[PDB]
């Protein structure tokens, strides 16, 4: 286990045996792919192979090393104000819980229909000094599940978190990180969906009727400062203890908007990664 | 234990067995609620149920995960002064030990008549820079039980704490936290009370005759600085190792003042969460 | 207490590390995990399923479907050539393929590979193509003889319909790079007529062949990296 | 190394914590500890020794010694009253007492208590006082009958000389506060004449009684706090 796990030799690939010639009836190279199945032909079948003892692990080819990597999924921003502190909808951020709001990683999952996981979660606040001294800028992140009082503005009554989670980070002390159970009323997170809100010819349809899972109302606790700032707290996410069901063809068209598939670009012709050739004859 | 405790499957709910029809005498659906007791009827009784093996824990429905969550119960503030340092009743805070001084969490307990617990306790100082440089602002929190010399002003003789508790926090070093035994001369903390100070038609009556448990006189040790500041040290509280006796109906009227029940708003009609319907016939 | 020394790396953050974190939401017992038909556990699996190949990688064709078919024609001449593509699995036409699309998530690849072709011809129709794998070393062959000299498979179109061509693994370095590299050049594969396409009366004289590529149990990848085949020259709105 | 998480409280300082610290002066072998008659191990001990009570807590008397004696007088009337003090052990006259002085170091007190009185009268002299403990509930009794109704002890002055009155523990809350509190009001104790002070010829007709208070094995304190009974409105020089 150790060795196999430390040496990373858990999932090893078979070796390529030796072959000889075959002047025989059964032709393994011939199958009818229309059966929708996949061929089973190998080196040893087609050629006069040798003998290679392999030693490549398919460890890094596991839904956990494919998925289990932290990725920017949101960049909370706060261009503070000292003029009006508090006021409605200010100096505090709130953002709807999701992934589709930012590619590369959105891409990655979407490779599967259903998914399930405990999520890591890390916050990377970066304090840009627009003043001659930033002081001590404390911070409060927290999580507002449904249906819950989402701060109208900066000091509601909801920042008491008498029964909510609020993580606090003060300049110097390291990056806040924490983790989370798999939050869904369903046995798995719906990466997709072919359902709607209802029969209302104006109902919602997508990944989304099934994912109202939160939001995040933010706060820079410290009170009024002299010299201004702007805070940019980056939100990275990692999938630990993941499972996946029914793989899908990757995405080749740059999306737009989340919780939707829509590609149809604003005017520009739909572009894809495929390159053009002069002729099939020369590559 | 582990698994059951790590998997959080300690308190599991029964499953819904299968039923068949009943053309029989005893009618479980009929009971007389006047007995003050509660009915005992189930799915299986009323319908022709199926068979569902459950898997929901009532773990998070425990007086410890209901109560055991940190909540703002006080926000100590100090608008420093450099003009007059010391002086009487300045630059040092003191505040009467309690909870009813701030909702959401006050709400939460009040759900029970009696309560008992060891309390966590955490301090979240936030130093607002009103100057061009905050220096090194050290801090001293401490606790003044009855009857004890409560600092008249900033440097008494009581800040020697020769036999008292004073926690010290210096800008950078993390949030001060500590915990505490259950402090009451009584076997439990009285969330309520129907008693008085005495027969004096001017005696006190409430939660309160039974809770003079302290106060907190504060201090910013550092001496005189140049560039001003304002400190806001937030006081969060968590209940660990809690017990509760005789549940009560929750509160629906926004209170005012602590150690009292009084709702009677200043003029405004007494408002409650109930919503109005046009008709009972349509919901 | 424990006289400790804080090591260099301490306090950092890596998008690639295995560490625990206090779980907010203590005491939460997640929805049970019901049974669901078809769950993956390894990219590999997906890599072993043959996905179709864009090969008619030509001009107007490209944004359409045709971009997938290869019509086997007339051919006045004889011993003439059909097409060619190069093996470097991250190279349009390959790339976009379930495999390619993937491989482009890792820095290095290895093992054998499988190319399969199918005759969307007729029943009464007949043909015989010669497919070949020209290992890395020289130039994609200009002529059949020259190409027949290396690895190949004669394909007899018949009641079967699908011929699968294997691409042995020939390389110096146990491993090849997924990224375009003159060194790690995997070679070319090409197809030519062995005989012709003969059709008895009143049958069309052009027909198509679809082509595919799935992996071999040989196969394996490594060094995960972010993809090539997708630039989010967005953002993404709401 | 050990992936560690630094907890909130970390780096603080508490005037009340049990932690180890590198000892400067390594290798030092302290002077042996010779044997010394009388060593304490518990405040309690000190609390069980009866210390004298200032009760003649009156005006000019107070800065002197008398402030300790209570002269038992004439009394033309009969069934008249001597003195009273209240039990709340942090209340002058009590407070200053070895006990009081102490209790004022803790927030809460409990158990029974012991009051002892001694006759510094004469030999040929005689008397009989009635002492009483009036539990918390009402007002210090104006009359003897009213007070005799509760807890008391008739004291026959004689060849003995010391009568010790116990103050049972009557309370709702297992525990009482050391600090003045209307709630935790322990009550009053008072003394009256049962008979008189009769003295045969040529003996003085006033005499004194000393009074004291020591604890009971009942007794116990908690929640240490800094004292009341001492304000250092100094400083202290050199």
């Amino acid at each position: 286990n150790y060795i196999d796990e430390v040496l990373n030799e858990v999932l090893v690939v078979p070796n390529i045996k030796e072959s000889h010639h075959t002047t025989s009836n059964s032709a393994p190279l011939l199958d009818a792919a229309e059966t929708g199945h996949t061929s089973n032909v190998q080196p040893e079948d087609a050629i006069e192979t040798r003998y290679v003892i392999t030693s490549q692990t398919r460890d890094e080819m596991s839904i956990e090393s494919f998925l289990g990597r932290s990725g920017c999924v949101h960049i909370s921003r706060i261009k503070v104000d000292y003029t009006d502190y508090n006021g409605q909808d200010i100096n505090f951020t709130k953002w709807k819980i999701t992934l589709q709001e930012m590619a590369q990683i959105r891409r990655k999952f979407e490779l599967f229909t259903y998914v399930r996981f405990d999520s890591e979660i890390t916050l990377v606040p970066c304090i840009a000094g627009r003043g001659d001294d930033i002081g001590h800028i404390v911070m409060q992140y927290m999580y507002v599940p449904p249906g819950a009082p989402i701060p109208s503005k900066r000091n509601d009554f909801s920042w008491q978190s008498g029964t909510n989670m609020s993580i606090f980070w003060q300049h110097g002390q390291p990056f806040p990180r924490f983790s989370i159970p798999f939050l869904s009323i369903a046995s798995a997170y719906y990466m997709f969906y072919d359902g709607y809100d209802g029969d209302n010819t104006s109902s919602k349809y997508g990944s989304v009727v099934t994912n109202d899972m939160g939001t995040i109302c933010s706060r820079i606790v410290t009170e009024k400062q002299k010299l201004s700032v702007v805070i940019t707290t980056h939100i990275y996410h990692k999938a630990k203890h993941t499972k996946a069901w029914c793989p899908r063809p990757p995405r080749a068209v740059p999306y737009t908007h989340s919780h939707v598939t829509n590609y149809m670009p604003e005017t520009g012709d739909v572009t894809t990664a495929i390159v053009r050739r002069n002729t099939i004859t020369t590559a | 234990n582990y698994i059951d405790e790590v998997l959080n499957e300690v308190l599991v709910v029964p499953n819904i067995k299968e039923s068949h029809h009943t053309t029989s005498n005893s009618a479980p659906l009929l009971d007389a609620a006047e007995t003050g007791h509660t009915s005992n009827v189930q799915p299986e009784d009323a319908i022709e149920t199926r068979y569902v093996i459950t898997s929901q824990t009532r773990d998070e429905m425990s007086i410890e995960s209901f109560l055991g969550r940190s909540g703002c119960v006080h926000i100590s503030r100090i608008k420093v002064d450099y003009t007059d340092y010391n002086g009487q009743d300045i630059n040092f805070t003191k505040w009467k030990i309690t909870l009813q001084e701030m909702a959401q969490i006050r709400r939460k307990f009040e759900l029970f008549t009696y309560v008992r617990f060891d309390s966590e306790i955490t301090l979240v100082p936030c130093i607002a820079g009103r100057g061009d440089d905050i220096g090194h602002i050290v801090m001293q929190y401490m606790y003044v039980p009855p009857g004890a010399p409560i600092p008249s002003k900033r440097n008494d003789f009581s800040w020697q704490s020769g036999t008292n508790m004073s926690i010290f926090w210096q800008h950078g070093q993390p949030f001060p936290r500590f915990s505490i035994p259950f402090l009451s001369i009584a076997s439990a903390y009285y969330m309520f009370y129907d008693g008085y100070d005495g027969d004096n038609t001017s005696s006190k009556y409430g939660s309160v005759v039974t809770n003079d448990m302290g106060t907190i006189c504060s201090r910013i040790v550092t001496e005189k600085q140049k560039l001003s500041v304002v400190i806001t040290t937030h006081i969060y509280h968590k209940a660990k190792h809690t017990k509760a006796w005789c549940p009560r109906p929750p509160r629906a009227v926004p209170y005012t003042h602590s150690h009292v029940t009084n709702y009677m708003p200043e003029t405004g009609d007494v408002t409650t969460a109930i919503v109005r319907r046009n008709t009972i016939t349509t919901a | 207490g424990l006289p400790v020394y804080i090591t260099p790396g301490s306090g950092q953050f890596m998008t690639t590390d295995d560490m625990q974190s206090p779980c907010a939401l203590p005491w939460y017992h997640p929805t049970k995990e019901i049974s669901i038909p078809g769950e993956v556990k390894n990219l590999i699996e997906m890599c072993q399923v043959d996905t179709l190949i864009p090969v008619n990688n030509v001009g107007n064709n490209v944004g359409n479907v045709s971009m997938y078919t290869v019509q086997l024609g007339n051919q006045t001449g004889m011993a003439q050539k059909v097409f060619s593509i190069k093996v470097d699995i991250t190279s349009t036409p390959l790339a976009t393929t379930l495999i390619g699309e993937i491989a482009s998530y890792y820095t290095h690849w290895t093992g054998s590979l499988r190319f399969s072709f199918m005759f969307c011809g007729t029943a009464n129709t007949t043909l015989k193509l010669l497919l070949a794998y020209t290992p890395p070393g020289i130039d994609e062959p200009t002529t059949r003889k020259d190409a027949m000299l290396g690895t190949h498979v004669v394909w007899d179109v018949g009641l079967q319909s699908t011929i699968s061509l294997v691409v042995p693994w020939v390389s110096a370095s146990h491993f090849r790079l997924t990224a375009d590299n003159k060194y790690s050049m995997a070679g070319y594969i090409t197809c030519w007529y062995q005989t012709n396409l003969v059709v008895p009366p009143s049958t069309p004289q052009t027909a198509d062949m679809l082509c595919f590529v799935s992996a071999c149990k040989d196969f394996c990848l490594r060094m995960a990296r972010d993809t090539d085949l997708h630039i989010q020259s967005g953002p993404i709105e709401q | 190394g050990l992936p560690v998480y630094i907890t909130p409280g970390s780096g603080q300082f508490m005037t009340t914590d049990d932690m180890q610290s590198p000892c400067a002066l390594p290798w030092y072998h302290p002077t042996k500890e010779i044997s010394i008659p009388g060593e304490v191990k518990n405040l309690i001990e000190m609390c069980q020794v009866d210390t004298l009570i200032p009760v003649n807590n009156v005006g000019n008397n107070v800065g002197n010694v008398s402030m300790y004696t209570v002269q038992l007088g004439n009394q033309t009337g009969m069934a008249q009253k001597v003195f009273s003090i209240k039990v709340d052990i942090t209340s002058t006259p009590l407070a200053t007492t070895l006990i009081g002085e102490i209790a004022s170091y803790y927030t809460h007190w409990t158990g029974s208590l012991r009051f002892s009185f001694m006759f510094c009268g004469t030999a040929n002299t005689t008397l009989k006082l009635l002492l009483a403990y009036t539990p918390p509930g009402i007002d210090e009794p104006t009359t003897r009958k009213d007070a005799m109704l509760g807890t008391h002890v008739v004291w026959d002055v004689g060849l003995q000389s010391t009568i010790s009155l116990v103050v049972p523990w009557v309370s709702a809350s297992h525990f009482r506060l050391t600090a003045d509190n209307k709630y935790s009001m322990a009550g009053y104790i008072t003394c009256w004449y049962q008979t008189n002070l009769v003295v045969p010829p040529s003996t003085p007709q006033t005499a004194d009684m000393l009074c004291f208070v020591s604890a009971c094995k009942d007794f116990c304190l908690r929640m240490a706090r800094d004292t009341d009974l001492h304000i250092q409105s100094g400083p202290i020089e050199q």
Binding site: V10, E64, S179, I180, K240 | - | Q20, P22, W27, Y28 | -
Partner: peptide, 19 residues
């Protein structure tokens, strides 16, 4: 060094294993 789930909950733990 391992299996020392310093934290109570299971959701908090390292990347799972492989089998």
């Amino acid at each position: 060094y391992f299996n020392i789930n310093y934290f109570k909950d299971a959701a908090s733990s390292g990347a799972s294993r492989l089998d």
